């Protein structure tokens, strides 16, 4: 059967689920999804039912999405409700801390201030901010209200126990837990800030825009960012306490039935969603409000399949809620490097013991997996080609240090000297060799420039065929690759045409043009590479294509390159930027210019790890022209990590 067992948490919900069930049968054909209805006592019982394979799907708030993820439940987000409208779907809100312009303090200076909260137990106004501040609170941290009462000098915390903790009600005596209290709710807590009762209001990104129509007034307010800087109120995407999904359908991590759940809900919205005007409506009920889904919902969006709960909720949210649940606080130290192979891990392990605890190791199977571990705190750092820096950046990470070899390396187009027809001005129908799709030298620069000439990124229809590792297996740009079985066209070492050397090899054996870096040909000719494919080559037999339309010798790269590559760079989270900057310079003065295979963790061209100063953003580090190019190449991107991050921040 293709049945989705929907979990209801009340009798009114099960009634709506049964109506849902019955109406779907009229509009979905026999080979299509159907609905079964399971009634449990609570959200938590539903989570357990689904983990136990007694049900399949339930829609949850953020907090319960977190509970659902924890062992032994192991559920994940699969479909999101959206709001507002189809043109600009709203899936998330942002919890923010709003303050007055010129009030003279940062997030790490909130102790002693006056706070305005929407209400005790509410997410944006209490659980998140207090969650994030948890370890700043004085001991004993239980009971929580007492500890908060002794952190802020006074507050309005609606619904708090002012009798036992009067500080929490200084700004709203009684701590009224209703609209009768002028400082209750989102508009209430903002008002508490605006009227000068408090110094900080813990509310939503939209709260200020709903209460202040004129920009001139909003310019008198700012937001506290967790890096202890301030930003304008319309920049909440880069300055929030947490990003929070409004309502999320979850399901088993393995065994599903993700695709069935989406097929069901997508067809349900199409026949019974917003403004469909049938007797049955998905987003309302005669039996009650917010049954199964929120009545305000306008539809559903499929959650990208790479997404897990921690990535969906985000690192900020998870930190906040972890603190609340676990109640654990520390008493700088170990940087967790991410390895991508057994040989990367072996160098890392012996680095760890050589560093004396200062460095530790974690491994993942691909770069993206390693990036995701950095985003969620399972790891802290790794070094990346410019193309992965962009992806890391879109995913919220920052570059901290750049690999130096000597402005960085040159991306060049290599060709065989014999075939003296080839020029940059027309490579249409020729055979191309790339390091990998999405890398600086192999793709982003050359195809970036190419995009401007042809105005599309279907490069498998420009070149006759090629090898560009990471392409779709049925693409003409996997035809020249050499990997066997499942390894064919894979962006890793089991594919011999992957990477700088690989792409040059590809040119030598099969291609017409290879997109690599300036030192690749010199290093793989003249006997320096002893492998049979390179041993007997000399660099004089290869030439570079210049932007002119002319050609030049390989040593002449400085006047015959496509563009300057931004260097490979170490990336991490903003909250570890300082510690990573410190520990690596302290480690490279000990183990720098003063791997057992090739280019493990860092390139072997790397002489030092260099300061970035003001270029600690992916946009500022890569430069605008590089970012523009990659932007245009996304239209044809197949990176599932990038798809997941962009779902959360388009
Ligand atoms: Fe590179």
From Swiss-Prot:
Tissue-by-tissue expression: Expressed by the liver and secreted in plasma.
Q: Which residues are glycosylated?
A: 30, 406, 455, 594
Q: Write down which residues bear the modification named Phosphoserine.
A: 363, 637
Amino acids binding hydrogencarbonate 1: 118, 122, 124-125
- Which InterPro entries has this protein been placed in? Serotransferrin_mammal, Transferrin, Transferrin-like_dom, Transferrin_Fe_BS
**Which residues in this protein are found as Dimethylated arginine?**
21
GO CC entries? apical plasma membrane; basal part of cell; basal plasma membrane; blood microparticle; cell surface; clathrin-coated endocytic vesicle membrane; clathrin-coated pit; cytoplasmic vesicle
Q: What SUPFAM superfamilies does the record point to?
A: Periplasmic binding protein-like II
Residues that bind hydrogencarbonate 2? 435, 439, 441-442
Q: Gene3D superfamilies, per this entry?
A: Periplasmic binding protein-like II
Q: Which GO terms describe its biological process?
A: antibacterial humoral response; cellular response to iron ion; intracellular iron ion homeostasis; iron ion transport; multicellular organismal-level iron ion homeostasis; osteoclast differentiation; positive regulation of proteasomal ubiquitin-dependent protein catabolic process; positive regulation of receptor-mediated endocytosis
Does the record bear Repeat in its keywords? Answer: yes
Q: Which cysteines are joined by disulfide bonds?
A: 7-46, 17-37, 116-192, 135-329, 156-172, 159-177, 169-175, 225-239, 332-579, 338-370, 348-361, 395-645, 433-506, 457-636, 467-481, 478-489, 546-560
Effect on the protein upon substituting residue 256 to S? In allele TF*C3; associated with a reduction in total iron binding capacity; risk factor for iron deficiency anemia in menstruating white women
Q: Which family does it belong to?
A: Belongs to the transferrin family.
Tell me the subunit arrangement: Monomer. Part of a complex composed of SLC40A1/ferroportin, TF/transferrin and HEPH/hephaestin that transfers iron from cells to transferrin. (Microbial infection) Binds to Neisseria transferrin-binding protein A (tbpA or tbp1). Forms a large complex with TbpA and TbpB.
Per the entry, what this protein does is: Transferrins are iron binding transport proteins which can bind two Fe(3+) ions in association with the binding of an anion, usually bicarbonate. It is responsible for the transport of iron from sites of absorption and heme degradation to those of storage and utilization. Serum transferrin may also have a further role in stimulating cell proliferation.
Q: What is known of its domains?
A: Has a bilobed structure, each lobe binds a single Fe(3+) ion. Does not always bind 2 Fe(3+) ions.
In Swiss-Prot or TrEMBL terms, this protein is called Serotransferrin
Gene it is expressed from:
TF
